[PDB]
Amino acid sequence: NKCVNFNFNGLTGTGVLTESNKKFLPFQQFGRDIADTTDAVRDPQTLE
Amino acid sequence: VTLAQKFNGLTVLPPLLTDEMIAQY
């Protein structure tokens, strides 16, 4: 819920991190929107 | 008529007249 510089397993950006209703498949690590741009990520230690 | 990009610095501005003001005119 705060604006932060993030690095998830090398996926580096700046944004506010929020809980999601998106369910990824077990092997998917980040999610992209219609313009091939990252809008969700899986946290590698606790997998939400 | 049927009608995201903000992380790329794109922004959409509202019109000066609302759709209620166009409906009034």
Swiss-Prot record, chain B:
Q: What is the effect of changing N8K?
A: In strain: Omicron/BA.1
Q: What does this protein do?
A: Subunit of the fusion protein that is processed upon entry into the host cell. Mediates fusion of the virion and cellular membranes by functioning as a class I viral fusion protein. Contains a viral fusion peptide that is unmasked after S2 cleavage. This cleavage can occur at the cell membrane by host TMPRSS2 or during endocytosis by host CSTL. In either case, this triggers an extensive and irreversible conformational change that leads to fusion of the viral envelope with the cellular cytoplasmic membrane, releasing viral genomic RNA into the host cell cytoplasm.
Q: What is this protein called?
A: Spike protein S2'
